[PDB]
Specification:
Chain lengths: 315, 315
């Protein structure tokens, strides 16, 4: 409820800021603003993926197209958001390099500054806002993490953009305060800026390379903060034993338990969130005591937290 | 062996064509070629993430950080390649739109045509070249798909680029054969092309919008051919029952087996490739006949192909 509401609100606000950019470009007769319209198309794509994902994670029930259900869909949503952000980070880095090798000068600094401040406000609002395993429930004795991962994915995109907004605002301010370049055409020369199109002193060209370098630094930050989630997400999709559980201790402890000849094929794997699933085979001697033995076996897995289990007797 | 060899060969050839583009740009004093040097960073990135996938998928061996192995790592490699291609497709579409709204004219058509023909040859070479679940093996009676998915992922990128090379070559040819635009400056006017920088008849402007539209069409093709894999890959990561297996028939057939009145918690899920894993609970009356009953139970799962199983008795 709350999560879907937050995502829908941000998607709606994102469309509103898209319309604001388009109309501002229309009044100003500029096209790079329209280019900013498309970054907005990309934030809208992250938000829509995070959401298919919330509806779907909710169908936590035993369908027959998935005997397990869909919570893993939410983890995958987090994963794909992370991968999308990493791809956008690489494309941003390659644009930063392309602007380092080819400096780019912009026009109408005031409207750029205004749209950048508005985007900074929107992104700060988003960052403040976004701050059948038979497991989550039931003691589990028998005869929520995914939400955090999905929101951290959306939070990283919003942070990414926010850093983009900070870079645009700072660059526009530095241009307006410290760049005195010439465009009138009378006593006009651009020594630093190459490519002064076709055939006083211009502004300090060092400032223009202020834009690339910070962007590069920016992506590093994002990549750093992106790395744990895509690690965590790709391990929720690798059937790796969760870090809290160690298998060597489990094997020796199980065998310690009475009546148990062995264990073989112990697979412990983590479902989406805290729904760790473990299946085992346990050799015994007397099948009748097997049941009490199996309850002891359930007690072990249990101490270790694995409260969903299937342990074949293999007499 | 063969797969790692193909991937390493294409990565090496990709670096060679990167160096060729950089040196050609150096001789020609052009920078958009350097832009082509960067798409190359992306083809190289797919090729590396398709590989770490190959390196890991072979460690199919009961580790204690992952009790299943890493074949799922290969499926995830396929998945991430697909997602990367889809992201590049969206960015390409948004660049195509940005060039539709702002037409772009290029210089030095001959070197662009040569690099495009070389890239077309490289991409055609790549397309012709790239054309413990205890399941793959063992009868499995007891007391390779992932490679296709990973290569189809790499094949789709290579196809994507190949279509990019075809578009660049065709556009360069059409410019050289049907575009007679003016740049000398004497009896010179660009009516269609707006933004003729700062202050005869130019070439037909309809051709210049030839570049955007085809690109858009191109991405559609890619998206179409990309959709099944990312569906197939994201279901290998959703624990959904494989399409060949239906659960309703399985439940009734297991119930029809003599000595069984119950099944509960039937989970059937597909490991990476054809390593379908199914765990079940089966209630019985006489534990001694349970063993022969369990062999019958193994026969059922088996017919259905589920060749790894754990089936707790719950007497
Ligand atoms: Zn963004
Ligand atoms: Zn317990
Ligand atoms: Zn490519
Ligand atoms: Zn069989």
């Amino acid at each position: 409820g709350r999560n879907r509401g937050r995502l829908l609100c941000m998607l709606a606000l994102t469309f509103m800021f898209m319309v604001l950019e388009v109309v501002v470009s229309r009044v100003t007769s500029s096209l790079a603003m329209l280019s900013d319209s498309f970054h907005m198309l990309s934030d809208v794509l992250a938000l829509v993926v995070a959401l298919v994902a919330e509806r779907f994670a909710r169908r936590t029930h035993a369908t027959q197209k998935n005997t397990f259900g869909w919570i893993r869909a939410e983890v995958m949503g987090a994963l794909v958001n992370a991968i999308f952000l990493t791809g956008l980070c690489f494309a941003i880095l390659l644009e930063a390099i392309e602007r380092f090798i080819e400096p780019h000068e912009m026009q109408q600094p005031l409207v750029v500054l205004g749209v950048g401040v508005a985007g900074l406000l929107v992104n700060v609002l988003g960052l403040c806002l976004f701050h059948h395993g038979h497991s989550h429930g039931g003691h589990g004795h028998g005869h929520d993490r995914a939400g955090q991962l999905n929101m951290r994915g959306v939070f990283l995109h919003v942070l990414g953009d926010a850093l983009g907004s900070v870079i645009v605002v700072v660059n526009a301010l530095v241009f307006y305060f410290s760049w005195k370049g010439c465009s009138e055409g009378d006593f006009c020369v651009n020594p630093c800026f190459p490519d002064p199109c076709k055939a006083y002193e211009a502004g300090p060209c060092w400032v223009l390379y202020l834009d690339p370098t910070l962007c590069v630094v920016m992506v590093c930050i994002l990549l750093y903060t992106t790395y744990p989630l895509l690690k965590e997400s790709a391990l929720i999709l690798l059937q790796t034993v969760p870090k809290q559980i160690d298998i060597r201790n489990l094997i020796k402890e199980l065998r310690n338990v009475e009546g148990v000849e062995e264990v073989h094929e112990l697979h412990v794997w983590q479902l989406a969130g805290s729904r760790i699933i473990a299946t085992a085979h346990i050799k015994c001697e007397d099948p009748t005591s097997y049941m009490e033995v199996a309850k002891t076996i359930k007690d072990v897995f249990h101490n270790h937290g694995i409260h969903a289990t299937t342990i074949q007797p293999e007499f």
